């Protein structure tokens, strides 16, 4: 596709196909002049037909095994696109068996290939978007939890809070680190890495702020109003960064 593929995985899978189609176009109908006979494609086309039914078999297993309602809705259209593109290639092989110089066959070869590239592309992006929603759910779960920081007023409730928040932050940090590495857009990787580091370094500051508050609200004298401000600031700065993470996780020029 004209745009860079979204992730390195999708890139390593489709880049070679996109390039080979360009070469085909340059060589054929939108290129030089190959009124030269194209060999029999019956075999290589049947192999595609088999690879297509395999992909669709795996894809359907995903649809009836996923909880993501969007994934269920968006994948079938891609099956149709790939299957329909395949039908043009089968037709191209037929025509070429009858006439190696068939012009319609050449246009079908190009359209069918583009169609399979496009359908496989949509299919992988739908999966990738489902994958990203999983990360956003973990991120929103931490947002929700930071929201209950207000409640903690006991030295033991603080140890309990920390007990949960610790792991959650670890899971999110790992998902973001692995996700950022898959991006093909550097500026997007940096934003995720910087936001994550900001949220990461603020975790101790938050815990330290809640402890100051608790030990404060368990010992007389007014140092309480203050303790309250820094805890709230932290919870806001962390939440803001996590929201920025959620935003960047969804950025795309498509692919």
């Amino acid at each position: 596709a004209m745009p860079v593929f979204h992730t390195r995985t999708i890139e390593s899978i489709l880049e070679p196909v996109a390039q080979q189609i360009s070469h085909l176009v340059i060589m054929h109908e939108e290129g030089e002049v190959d009124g030269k006979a194209i060999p029999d494609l019956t075999a290589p086309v049947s192999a595609v037909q088999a690879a297509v039914s395999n992909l669709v078999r795996v894809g359907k297993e995903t649809v009836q095994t996923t909880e993501d309602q969007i994934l269920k809705r968006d994948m079938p259209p891609a099956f149709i696109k790939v299957e329909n593109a395949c039908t043009k290639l089968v037709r191209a092989a037929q025509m070429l068996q009858a006439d190696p110089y068939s012009v319609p066959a050449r246009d079908y070869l190009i359209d069918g290939s583009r169609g399979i590239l496009s359908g496989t592309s949509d299919l992988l992006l739908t999966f990738d978007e489902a994958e990203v929603r999983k990360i956003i759910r973990v991120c929103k779960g931490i947002l929700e939890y930071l929201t209950v920081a207000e409640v903690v007023e006991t030295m033991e409730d603080l140890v309990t809070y920390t007990k949960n928040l610790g792991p959650g932050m670890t899971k999110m940090a790992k998902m973001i680190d692995e996700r950022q590495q898959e991006l093909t857009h550097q500026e997007h990787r940096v934003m995720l890495v910087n936001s994550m580091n900001t949220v990461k370094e603020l975790l101790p500051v938050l815990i330290s702020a809640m402890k100051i508050f608790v030990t404060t609200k368990n010992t007389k004298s007014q140092g309480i109003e203050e303790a309250l401000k820094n805890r709230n600031f932290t919870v806001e700065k962390m939440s803001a960064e996590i929201n920025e993470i959620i935003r960047v996780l969804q950025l795309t020029s498509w692919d």
Binding site: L24, I38, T120
Partner: peptide, 24 residues
Amino acid sequence: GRPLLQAAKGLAGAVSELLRSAQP
């Protein structure tokens, strides 16, 4: 979650092979 990715790589490979065979 990679069975879908492997199915896709397989199709990608098959199309690449087709385009290579189409070269006259």
